[PDB]
Amino acid sequence: DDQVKKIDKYLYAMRLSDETLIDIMTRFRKEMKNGLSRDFNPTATVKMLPTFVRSIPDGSEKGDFIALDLGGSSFRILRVQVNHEKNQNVHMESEVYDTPENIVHGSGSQLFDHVAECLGDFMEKRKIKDKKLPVGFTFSFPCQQSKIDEAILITWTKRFKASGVEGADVVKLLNKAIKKRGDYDANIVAVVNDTVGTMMTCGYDDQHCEVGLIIGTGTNACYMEELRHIDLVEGDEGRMCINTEWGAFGDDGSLEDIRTEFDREIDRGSLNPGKQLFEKMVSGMYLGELVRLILVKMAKEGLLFEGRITPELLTRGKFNTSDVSAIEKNKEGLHNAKEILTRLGVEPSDDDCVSVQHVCTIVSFRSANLVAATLGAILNRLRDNKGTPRLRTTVGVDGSLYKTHPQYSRRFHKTLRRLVPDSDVRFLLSESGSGKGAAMVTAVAYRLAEQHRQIEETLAHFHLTKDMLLEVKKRMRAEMELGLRKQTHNNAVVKMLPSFVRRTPDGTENGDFLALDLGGTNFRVLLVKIRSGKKRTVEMHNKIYAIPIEIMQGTGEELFDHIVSCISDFLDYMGIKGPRMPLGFTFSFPCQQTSLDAGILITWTKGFKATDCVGHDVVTLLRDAIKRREEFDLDVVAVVNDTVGTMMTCAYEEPTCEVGLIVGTGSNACYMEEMKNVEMVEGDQGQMCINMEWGAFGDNGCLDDIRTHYDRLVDEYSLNAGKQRYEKMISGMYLGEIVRNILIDFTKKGFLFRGQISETLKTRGIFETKFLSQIESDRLALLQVRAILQQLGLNSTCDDSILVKTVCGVVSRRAAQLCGAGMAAVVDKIRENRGLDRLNVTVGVDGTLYKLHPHFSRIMHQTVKELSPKCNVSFLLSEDGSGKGAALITAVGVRLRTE
Amino acid sequence: DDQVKKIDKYLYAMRLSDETLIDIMTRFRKEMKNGLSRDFNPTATVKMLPTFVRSIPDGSEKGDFIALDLGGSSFRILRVQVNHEKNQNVHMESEVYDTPENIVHGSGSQLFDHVAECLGDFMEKRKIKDKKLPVGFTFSFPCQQSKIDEAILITWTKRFKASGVEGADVVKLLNKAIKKRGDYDANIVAVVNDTVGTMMTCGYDDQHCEVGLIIGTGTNACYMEELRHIDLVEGDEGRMCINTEWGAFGDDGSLEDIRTEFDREIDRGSLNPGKQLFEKMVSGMYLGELVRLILVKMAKEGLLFEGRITPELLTRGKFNTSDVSAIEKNKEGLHNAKEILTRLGVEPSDDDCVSVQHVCTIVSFRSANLVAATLGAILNRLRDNKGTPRLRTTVGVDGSLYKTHPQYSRRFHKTLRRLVPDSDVRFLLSESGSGKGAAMVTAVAYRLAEQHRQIEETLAHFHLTKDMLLEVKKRMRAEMELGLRKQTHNNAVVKMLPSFVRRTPDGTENGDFLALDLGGTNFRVLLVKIRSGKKRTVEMHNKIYAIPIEIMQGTGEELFDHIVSCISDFLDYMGIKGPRMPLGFTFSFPCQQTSLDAGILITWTKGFKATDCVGHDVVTLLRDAIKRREEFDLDVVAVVNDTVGTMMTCAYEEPTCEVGLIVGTGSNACYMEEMKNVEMVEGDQGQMCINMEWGAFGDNGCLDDIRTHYDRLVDEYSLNAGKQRYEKMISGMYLGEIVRNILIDFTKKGFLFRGQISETLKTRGIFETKFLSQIESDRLALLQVRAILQQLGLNSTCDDSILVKTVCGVVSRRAAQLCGAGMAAVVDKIRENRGLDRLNVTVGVDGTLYKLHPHFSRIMHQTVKELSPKCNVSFLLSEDGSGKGAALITAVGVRLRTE
Numbered sequence A, B: 001d002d003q004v005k006k007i008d009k010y011l012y013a014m015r016l017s018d019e020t021l022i023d024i025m026t027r028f029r030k031e032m033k034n035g036l037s038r039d040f041n042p043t044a045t046v047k048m049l050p051t052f053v054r055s056i057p058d059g060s061e062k063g064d065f066i067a068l069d070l071g072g073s074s075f076r077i078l079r080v081q082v083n084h085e086k087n088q089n090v091h092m093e094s095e096v097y098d099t100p101e102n103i104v105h106g107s108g109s110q111l112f113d114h115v116a117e118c119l120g121d122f123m124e125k126r127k128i129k130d131k132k133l134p135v136g137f138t139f140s141f142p143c144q145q146s147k148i149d150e151a152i153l154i155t156w157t158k159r160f161k162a163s164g165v166e167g168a169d170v171v172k173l174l175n176k177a178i179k180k181r182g183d184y185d186a187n188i189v190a191v192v193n194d195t196v197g198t199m200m201t202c203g204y205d206d207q208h209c210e211v212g213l214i215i216g217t218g219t220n221a222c223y224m225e226e227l228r229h230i231d232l233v234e235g236d237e238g239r240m241c242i243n244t245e246w247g248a249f250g251d252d253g254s255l256e257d258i259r260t261e262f263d264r265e266i267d268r269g270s271l272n273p274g275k276q277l278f279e280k281m282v283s284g285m286y287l288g289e290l291v292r293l294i295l296v297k298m299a300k301e302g303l304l305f306e307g308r309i310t311p312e313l314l315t316r317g318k319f320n321t322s323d324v325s326a327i328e329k330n331k332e333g334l335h336n337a338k339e340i341l342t343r344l345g346v347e348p349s350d351d352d353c354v355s356v357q358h359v360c361t362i363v364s365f366r367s368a369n370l371v372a373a374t375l376g377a378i379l380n381r382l383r384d385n386k387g388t389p390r391l392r393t394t395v396g397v398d399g400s401l402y403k404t405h406p407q408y409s410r411r412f413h414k415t416l417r418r419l420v421p422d423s424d425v426r427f428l429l430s431e432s433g434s435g436k437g438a439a440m441v442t443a444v445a446y447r448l449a450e451q452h453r454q455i456e457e458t459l460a461h462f463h464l465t466k467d468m469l470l471e472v473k474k475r476m477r478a479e480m481e482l483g484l485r486k487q488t489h490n491n492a493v494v495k496m497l498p499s500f501v502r503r504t505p506d507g508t509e510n511g512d513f514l515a516l517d518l519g520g521t522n523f524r525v526l527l528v529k530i531r532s533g534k535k536r537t538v539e540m541h542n543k544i545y546a547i548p549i550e551i552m553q554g555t556g557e558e559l560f561d562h563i564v565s566c567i568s569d570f571l572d573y574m575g576i577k578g579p580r581m582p583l584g585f586t587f588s589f590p591c592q593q594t595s596l597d598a599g600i601l602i603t604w605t606k607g608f609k610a611t612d613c614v615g616h617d618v619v620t621l622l623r624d625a626i627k628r629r630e631e632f633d634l635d636v637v638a639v640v641n642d643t644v645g646t647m648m649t650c651a652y653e654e655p656t657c658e659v660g661l662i663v664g665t666g667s668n669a670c671y672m673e674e675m676k677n678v679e680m681v682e683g684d685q686g687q688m689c690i691n692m693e694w695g696a697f698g699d700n701g702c703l704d705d706i707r708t709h710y711d712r713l714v715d716e717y718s719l720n721a722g723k724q725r726y727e728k729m730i731s732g733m734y735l736g737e738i739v740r741n742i743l744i745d746f747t748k749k750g751f752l753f754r755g756q757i758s759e760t761l762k763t764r765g766i767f768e769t770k771f772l773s774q775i776e777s778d779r780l781a782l783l784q785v786r787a788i789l790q791q792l793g794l795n796s797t798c799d800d801s802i803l804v805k806t807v808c809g810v811v812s813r814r815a816a817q818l819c820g821a822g823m824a825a826v827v828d829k830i831r832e833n834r835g836l837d838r839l840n841v842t843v844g845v846d847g848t849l850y851k852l853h854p855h856f857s858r859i860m861h862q863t864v865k866e867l868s869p870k871c872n873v874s875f876l877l878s879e880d881g882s883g884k885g886a887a888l889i890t891a892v893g894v895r896l897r898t899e
């Protein structure tokens, strides 16, 4: 018995006490916390990688898929088929493909080309090549994943080292491989770790399974962690499977007290020097060589074989874990030992077979013990999570060492239950391998992939290519010409109306003017004082007056009686009622003018529909209302479009400004045109600012080309169906509605809101500019988005919030691009007007959508730059509204009247 | 009572119950939470802006300071002198500069010119233009700040709208205006809110001050928050003053059930519609007008002056808060109310005067109560932070309203104390203004600006411009020439040694080979099998072997005896000991060679310095050690430098690979030169791989130009003082030492670690390549950085962490750049050699620093691409050492021998 109590001392370092195993477990419990926090994760050796698997199979899984299994003992390819509807129990076939050491160590090419070939063959043997079967991929190595169908290899482990893979996405690599073959197609849909696949397999039969264990070639474990603990994944709702990749436990010196002179030597001869230190003490790729190393040490000291030592005993890996498993069976360990030892060359004495069989014991016992130390940590986590004073769960398992060693399973289970007897754990052992669990993953993944495909398909119609954009620009320019020319003018949809403002501020304007601002979100009245000369100044005051919908769509008389009423109030307010003052009337609607002070309303736009206004001169209507009240008398000098007012506001200080843009409730633009081109106004000298009224672009159908189902719905249900189509794809009054329609559709499709169309969601106007701007704010936590959605009355989850945001962006982006296409045409027509190669011009802009939206202006500018590269456009934001420009315009109006 | 009764029931909604006040208080409480949350902040109306003031004055501030003050009722410029030594503890002179309307509503340009001008006049009069007096800036508006000397205006409030300031840094704007004048220099060192100034001003007299409260034109409050609660500021250490900007409270509708029709109307006429809603129910700029609106309302409804209404009454601003104050006077209220109302045109009956005065009461009182609620929330917040049952704090205050209203202060104090029972509160009025406080801040700020100035001064010496890099490239080129032409070779520092390797792999290399890898971080012996034709393969194994201190700096005999020991052991490991295998020796120290299998150690580099090695043929040394053992025999076919090996390893796959680079422990490069240029080896036929040994670049002083005090200290303390200058500015063995020495220096100057030069900091090596790479890891967390340093033995704060990270980055960047310049010279020499106008060559790369650093490679590649634009260089990272390439060189050796 001395022949054994002696070893125990020699290998005494590799005999861990329960006292010790407790410290190990404690440490791994920490490593887990560190691997999960976003602060410490980058340092942690235990990556706790997110797996994107939300729970174990339930039974709803159904379909037919192909699974790949690489990284373990053998490269397998399975085929799982299940459908409880048709009443077809889980069925599955499989095959193995020989993979030479040279492929596992070659280039990713060789490897993945080899994988592609094996998939080709596998499918050629069932002729399922033409079937759109979803592919699953079980990949044993640690991977960075942001989505289930992505796998960026962090680092090879076990037996693989292939160049050009670490840091890449194995999904893209495999897809490339296939492509290069053009022998068939394959829809890779998920990549899972063998652990995760194992947890899934057992879960399928045991709904208590919350863990996945793999003690084979290598060792690793996955478990169901709470989403409120996975810092690296936005969301707390529910749980997600976490791959711990604990093999790297101690890769940073963590276990320098546990590791022995033998672990250090096996490492110095390993493929991955310094890494997977915990694993190199446990898995079956190392146990065999560990034993051999210990036997070489002893032999050199005469403790075995009479200190005999053959070349085979020194050769790497001449001792297999097979032999470590064959030595330990009760019946025949010693008989096997003899044969194994004898083959080596040493002169195996019945004593040697007894000593060697004990070395194996200590080695194999330790591994198991360790895996119990860490597993204990996982369970300790689960119980703590739940809260129950006692944990009850099932642990999946797989891998060759656990499966073949006749003492490992037995011993391990015992040690674990002892370290954490505060729980009743069942050990279900996969038999199918991982395929079942894996395909159970593909099922769900593919299910989600399909939805996503439909989503993307629908949103794809809102994407515009450089060329499509250039086409819009072109169509815009064409419509611009039709509008300017007397012949084609009556039918042209882009009216190109004359403003009768012939020049930007010349710095002589002087005086006190009243102003009106009607058509934007806020109706106001203003007093603007301009003082020219050396020391020039501008002083203004205003006040917002509400207009009740009932009035905003009552009768003409009513509307202007209210307006004039507001004017009276403002006059009292400013303490200036009495005098007869000149007035500029900013009226944001398409008007036919014959002079600066006459403007006949062509048609209502946006939200206004007062009766008996269209066809009238809005200046006449105003004068009438002034006469009716009889309280005071004014000299209405001008009627101005907000575009024009905006351009003048900016021209006041920026003389390079010759363009006006509004992107608010509605959208429109104006620019300085050469009189020779304004065929609708006699004269060919100088210039005139043209109120484009480009919102109507597309009303003749010249855009049906790019309008969508959702665009038509908004148009079709608006106050002015068939009109302002271009605007209806750009401004803040409509974007929200487009979004809302997209969402209603997605909900009927079951992609959102658990497929229930909220009463809120059926309320029109719900997505105001304000909300759209907030939703698309950068780095805006999903938690915040969800917050805003619930605020509107939309009870949404994190996935909902993500989808919604994506939709808002698609719409707001298209809007900026279409707007830019228009401006592109405009600035380019100017460049030509001046026969320039390059043109510098600045645009005066205004509008709530433009001010509030965090992407519009940016994308809009980018677009104008790409579409009209021969122009350098400066967009200057108007901070005081349109009033200064209207006033400057009123001044000139007076110089003409008093002329 | 009849009168007062009616009015009380009329303005009912403006009388806030304690129930309601507690409600509002709980609301602000939550608003503060959201404001401070990184998740909710973007949508929160109360911004809770970091101020970057860590604490109230500690009495250690001294100097002469100029302070600006804008945004309040009057623009002021002050001068504050402070000495503890002087015993003229605080002296200060001020001067108010009239600031007309046009300037407050004009362009930011006029605005800041006016400021710069005033500041000029101010200094002129004191004849102080000539001193460098640090300038503090009190700008009473909400600002975004990442540091105390930056102030991006978020939005105007109160009386200001100046175009082009919102979204801009007012500090820049001011400097801009000052630079336009030219009359003087202005060192703007800090920017503060007036609340913050007030707090610091009172904090100067009362060490218990933790709040700054303003109630004048506008209303706002700041306070000391725990830095662990401020999400938007990385750090958990200490406290920082937070500018709540509680004026915007309720701007999201949060307070609509509190706001009245009167508050909505005052808003509709406000300079900032829909904003500062809370403030518009509180501050002096509004209380008066808010009253007027009510009088006009009652007057119209007959409840005042027979229903009479004069124009004066209806006019905006005809009723100041000043008038509100007077009317509320115990003595003359009724009397004062009489004169005011009579001047307004109405016929004030004695009952009117009472009525009006009572309206004032309700308004004024509502304001105080409101502030009392929000302040209360703040107080409660403070206590919770201390976690104590009671709280004792001092609150600094300022603002025309609070200072001139005959009841406000008292009512305010009353309600507050009643709302926060378990607190004792001192209200200290700041009679001097916020000036003293601003100056105190400016003191600490300047002190810190001076530290930064010095740090950047230092660090700047590590900055290299295009032109400097081009110059390095140029110099590198010359050195290459000198090294090649025998006329100059002997004196040349860059030796340009020949490797006697004439061509990259041809594709026929075949057989088994033994390799040695000595020089990098790991000594290892390798076995490499190369099969050719058909399919071509490369199977390789290897084992790491530690070289003990005794051995590595012992004697040549010991070193090579140890080596031969491991060679034998490896042979056993591979079970191949017997046959006379051919061997490849990678010895990566400079060697003078006459043949492929002859290398004379020119000199030791890096950490190696065994004796009686230098000047010997390393091949002879190895053979001698082998002969001595006699255990086995081998045929050393070649001695190779890791650079050359690396090039071969990569060229094996990439035929355009004609360059090798190593950035590991050491740094060096090799390429394919044309014999006509290799004057040190007879022959002008074919090419030759030149091992540059460029590490020694600069050893002749040709870089003293860019080498710093720290480079010299590292060189001067190295094992090879005066040699490998270039390398010492690049490789992983030195970068850390450059960093460490910079850190020591910074610490003595007192910029780091409380001026404590720890024992750890004195230890060389502390900053390994490994650590150095972790620190600069993108998007790393400050605590993560602090954690990493803590594990080193460097007790360090977050500020300390920032500086160490900055230093590290400066050093590694110079490294990548300097390296880049080197390679730029190399690839460009080939281009010109070959008479090409553009060359496409790829470089094989290796070395730990290069592999692990998160920025080096990127920056380096970038530099190459920039310095040698006529070259397109690809960098292939060798994933398996030089092993392959060495065996490919062995192959050719054995061949050319038998052949």
Ligand SMILES: O=P(O)(O)OC[C@H]1O[C@@H](O)[C@@H](O)[C@@H](O)[C@@H]1O
Binding pocket: A069, A071, A072, A073, A074, A138, A140, A194, A197, A214, A215, A216, A217, A218, A284, A398, A399, A400, A401, A432, A433, A434, A435
């Ligand atoms: O690599 P071995 O020792 O066979 O064990 C691990 C392997 O087990 C097999 O049954 C499969 O489940 C593989 O997915 C897994 O990687």
Ligand SMILES: O=P(O)(O)OC[C@H]1O[C@@H](O)[C@@H](O)[C@@H](O)[C@@H]1O
Binding pocket: A517, A518, A519, A520, A521, A522, A586, A588, A642, A645, A646, A662, A663, A664, A665, A666, A846, A847, A848, A849, A880, A881, A882, A883
């Ligand atoms: O429709 P919204 O978003 O209010 O923007 C358009 C409005 O912009 C305001 O600033 C004014 O200049 C109005 O003249 C204009 O109609």
Ligand SMILES: O=P(O)(O)OC[C@H]1O[C@@H](O)[C@@H](O)[C@@H](O)[C@@H]1O
Binding pocket: B069, B071, B072, B073, B074, B138, B140, B194, B197, B214, B215, B216, B217, B218, B398, B399, B400, B401, B432, B433, B434, B435
């Ligand atoms: O709004 P007013 O009445 O000027 O009060 C607030 C102002 O008080 C002054 O004494 C100064 O301390 C300023 O820093 C502050 O902004």
Ligand SMILES: O=P(O)(O)OC[C@H]1O[C@@H](O)[C@@H](O)[C@@H](O)[C@@H]1O
Binding pocket: B517, B519, B520, B521, B522, B586, B588, B642, B645, B662, B663, B664, B665, B666, B732, B846, B847, B848, B849, B880, B881, B882, B883
């Ligand atoms: O000095 P280090 O950081 O180990 O890097 C340089 C070393 O790289 C290793 O992989 C080997 O290829 C050596 O040939 C080389 O000398």
Ligand SMILES: OC[C@H]1O[C@@H](O)[C@H](O)[C@@H](O)[C@@H]1O
Binding pocket: A071, A072, A139, A140, A141, A142, A157, A158, A193, A194, A195, A214, A216, A217, A218, A219, A220, A221, A245, A247, A276, A279
């Ligand atoms: O294959 C079993 C285990 O091997 C380990 O080396 C890998 O890192 C894991 O991803 C895997 O679970």
Ligand SMILES: OC[C@H]1O[C@@H](O)[C@H](O)[C@@H](O)[C@@H]1O
Binding pocket: A519, A520, A587, A588, A589, A590, A605, A606, A641, A642, A643, A662, A664, A665, A666, A667, A668, A669, A693, A695, A724, A727
């Ligand atoms: O409000 C901006 C634009 O909106 C368009 O719908 C109106 O018809 C235009 O007159 C106006 O310029």
Ligand SMILES: OC[C@H]1O[C@@H](O)[C@H](O)[C@@H](O)[C@@H]1O
Binding pocket: B071, B072, B139, B140, B141, B142, B157, B158, B193, B194, B195, B214, B216, B217, B218, B219, B220, B221, B245, B247, B276, B279
């Ligand atoms: O000046 C008193 C307060 O007025 C508020 O309206 C401003 O937004 C604050 O920045 C300032 O502290």
Ligand SMILES: OC[C@H]1O[C@@H](O)[C@H](O)[C@@H](O)[C@@H]1O
Binding pocket: B519, B520, B587, B588, B589, B590, B605, B606, B641, B642, B643, B662, B664, B665, B666, B667, B668, B669, B693, B695, B724, B727
């Ligand atoms: O090891 C990398 C490089 O370090 C340099 O300092 C050595 O002198 C070279 O021989 C070697 O190529």
Ligand code: NA
Binding pocket: A227, A228, A229, A230, A231, A232, A233, A234, A235, A236
């Ligand atoms: Na999470």
Ligand code: NA
Binding pocket: A675, A676, A677, A678, A679, A680, A681, A682, A683, A684
């Ligand atoms: Na014309």
Ligand code: NA
Binding pocket: B227, B228, B229, B230, B231, B232, B233, B234, B235, B236
């Ligand atoms: Na913090």
Ligand code: NA
Binding pocket: B675, B676, B677, B678, B679, B680, B681, B682, B683, B684
């Ligand atoms: Na030559």
